[PDB]
RNA sequence: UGCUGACU
DNA sequence: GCCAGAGACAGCGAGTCAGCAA
DNA sequence: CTGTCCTCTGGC
């Protein structure tokens, strides 16, 4: 019954990850304890969640928990079919051992039609975003980046870079070309604000 | 129009240097010198009286510039 | 690889830095006509940036691209069009290059 | 240029 | 194609004064 | 005298 503890931690972390992306999540899911998780729900196909977005109610996300410890191209297709038929665009695949290396470039191959993304199970046992040293990241909107570049007379290159595989760019699901504001809690100035172009 | 109103120390240094190099090349002194042979003392005397017709052209990191007057600049 | 790198260089020359990964993904999802349309659209809509291309983060990308090319794609290989075109140049100490039969 | 001493 | 075997290869504080031999 | 390259080589 440690499998259930792992399932509960991963589900709580994914609920927090979905709330930080701006999806409609209730307080109970974010404050759900183990005794009630196991009360509700055992399997790995009824842990799949489907969440809606604050705006764009059609824009929803779908979280998978594949059974195969090493997901492959066929496993990816089997529920890319589910997504294509239910009419969703985004997904999130929590894998237990990894993805066979061809799969990673397949997930990338699926054009903005159906954009997927993978997360290891050991990466979700804790919320890195809740570490002391990790600042708060905020994906800037297309109209705030323009005002930033205009205030500092900048170009989008010539800005600090954040890797597209950064453990906190993968969590906040930030695509390339997006600028993220970062609020460092500084011992010197309190709440220093920086900006990083995702690339 | 958006940069600091005061005159940085580097600007004071360069303005004094240039005014002194001008005075030394036989330029008219608008400060009524009183027996001093140093052009840098004369340049300081002029800076204190707010008589220096030079235009500090502050360059921003993208090529854009702002032209300030040495008179319209708070000397500390 | 030849055409991908050609287009990536064409876009780097003007500064466009997202075009690099965009071209690579356009390729993998798919050759010259597929890539040259996007690359010309970039180089046209993003010109006026030949002076704003001599910045760090634009030199690192070109450095990495050309280094990876010279390091991974210039090894002796059986020839594509004629299967027996490995006239193995193999250079001894400088001032010496030896082709075989 | 070199090499052998020496100074802070 | 995956990653050891290496085997090159490059770096190694600042300034100063002499003499002697080639 | 150390650490990365980094260009093979070599085996697999
Ligand atoms: N090779 C060297 C030797 C010396 N120096 C410089 O000379 C200073 C005095 O040397 P020093 O040997 O007299 C040390 P100090 O603390 O003054 O000695 P004390 O305990 O007897 O009072 C050092 O601190 C360096 O700045 C150098 O640059 N390279």
CATH of the domain at A122: 3.40.1340.10
CA-CA-CA-CA dihedral for A106, A108, A111, A113, to nearest 10:
80
User: Same domain for A72 and A145?
Assistant: no
Cα–Cα distance between A92 and A74 in angstroms, integer?
16
d(CA A48, CA A23): 15
Q: How far is the CA of B50 from the C1' of E22 (A)?
A: 68
DSSP-derived 3-state class of residue B37: coil
Please indicate, yes or no, whether residues A59 and A86 belong to a single structural domain of this protein. Answer: yes
Interface test mutation site (partner A, options C20, C34, C57, max chain A beta carbons within 10 A): C57
Q: What are chain B's domains?
A: 1-76 (3.90.940.10)
Structural domains counted in chain A: 2
Alpha-carbon separation of residue A187 from A97, A184, A192, A194, A195 (angstroms): 40, 9, 10, 15, 19
CA A111, CA A175: separation in Å to the nearest integer?
A: 13
Q: Which residue has the tokens 């404050």?
A: A31
Q: Enter the DSSP assignment of A80.
A: H
Method: cryo-EM
Q: How far is A127 from chain B (nearest CA, A)?
A: 40
Say how far apart CA C16 and CA B56 lie, in whole Å: 35
Bridge-based pairing of strands A190-198 and B55-59 is unpaired
| Exposed e or buried b per residue across A77-86, where buried means at least 16 C-beta atoms within 10 angstroms of its C-beta | eebbeebeee
Q: What token pair was written down for B57?
A: 């052209």
Domain boundary among A64, A96, A126: A126
Distance CA A94, CA A77 (A): 15
The parent domain of residue A147 ranges over 127-199
| Nucleotide minimizing C1' to CA distance for residue C67 | F6
Whether residues A138 and A80 share a domain: the answer is no
Q: Same domain, yes or no, for A197 and A142?
A: yes
**Separation of A83 CA from ligand 1 center, angstroms?**
74
Q: What share of chain B is helix, strand, coil (3-state, %, to 5)?
A: 35, 15, 50
Residue where a domain stops, chosen among A99, A126, A153: A126
Across the interface, whether the CB atoms of C17 and A199 are under 8 A apart is answered: yes
- Contact between A120 and A98 (Cβ < 8 Å): yes
**Cited resolution, angstroms:** 2.9
Question: What are phi and psi for residue A104, nearest 5 degrees?
Answer: -60, -40
Q: Which two tokens stand for residue A31?
A: 């404050």
> Rounded CA gap, C97 and C101, in Å?
13
- Of A126, A156, A186, the one marking the end of a domain is A126
On whether both A93 and A170 belong to a single domain, the answer is: no
- Asked if the C-beta of B2 comes within 8 angstroms of chain A's C-beta atoms, the answer is no
């Amino acid at each position: 019954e440690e499998e259930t503890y792992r399932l509960w931690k991963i589900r709580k972390t994914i609920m927090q990850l979905c709330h930080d992306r701006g999806y409609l999540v209730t307080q109970d899911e974010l404050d759900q304890t183990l005794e009630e998780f196991k009360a509700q729900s055992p399997r790995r196909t009824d842990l799949t969640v489907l969440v809606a977005h604050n705006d764009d109610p059609t824009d929803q996300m779908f979280v998978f928990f594949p059974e195969e410890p090493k997901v492959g191209i066929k496993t990816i297709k089997v529920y890319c079919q589910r997504m294509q038929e239910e009419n969703i665009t985004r997904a999130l695949i929590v894998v237990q051992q990894g993805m066979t290396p061809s799969a990673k470039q397949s997930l990338v191959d699926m054009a903005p039609k159906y954009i997927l993304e993978q997360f290891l199970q050991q990466e979700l046992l804790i919320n890195i975003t809740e570490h002391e040293l990790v600042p708060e990241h905020v994906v800037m909107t297309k109209e705030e980046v323009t005002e930033l570049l205009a205030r500092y007379k900048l170009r989008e290159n010539q800005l600090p870079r954040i890797q597209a595989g950064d453990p906190v760019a993968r969590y906040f699901g930030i695509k390339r070309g997006q600028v993220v504001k970062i609020i460092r809690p500084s011992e010197t100035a309190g709440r220093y604000i920086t900006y990083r172009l995702v690339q | 129009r958006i940069t600091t109103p005061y005159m940085t120390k580097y600007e004071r240094a360069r303005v004094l240097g240039t005014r002194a190099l001008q005075i030394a090349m036989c330029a008219p002194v608008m400060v009524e010198l009183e027996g001093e042979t140093d052009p840098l003392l004369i340049a300081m005397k002029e800076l204190k009286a707010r008589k220096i017709p030079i235009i500090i052209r502050r360059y921003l990191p993208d090529g854009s510039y702002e032209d300030w007057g040495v008179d319209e600049l708070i000397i500390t | 690889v030849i055409h991908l790198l050609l287009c990536q260089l064409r876009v780097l020359e003007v500064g466009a830095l997202q075009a690099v990964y965009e071209l690579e993904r356009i390729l993998n999802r798919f050759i010259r006509e597929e890539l040259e349309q996007y690359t010309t659209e970039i180089v046209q809509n993003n010109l006026l940036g030949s002076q704003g291309a001599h910045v760090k983060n634009v030199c690192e990308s070109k450095s990495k691209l050309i280094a990876l090319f010279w390091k991974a794609h210039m090894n002796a290989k059986r020839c594509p069009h004629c299967k027996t075109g490995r006239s193995v140049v193999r250079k001894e100490h400088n001032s010496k290059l030896t082709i075989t039969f």
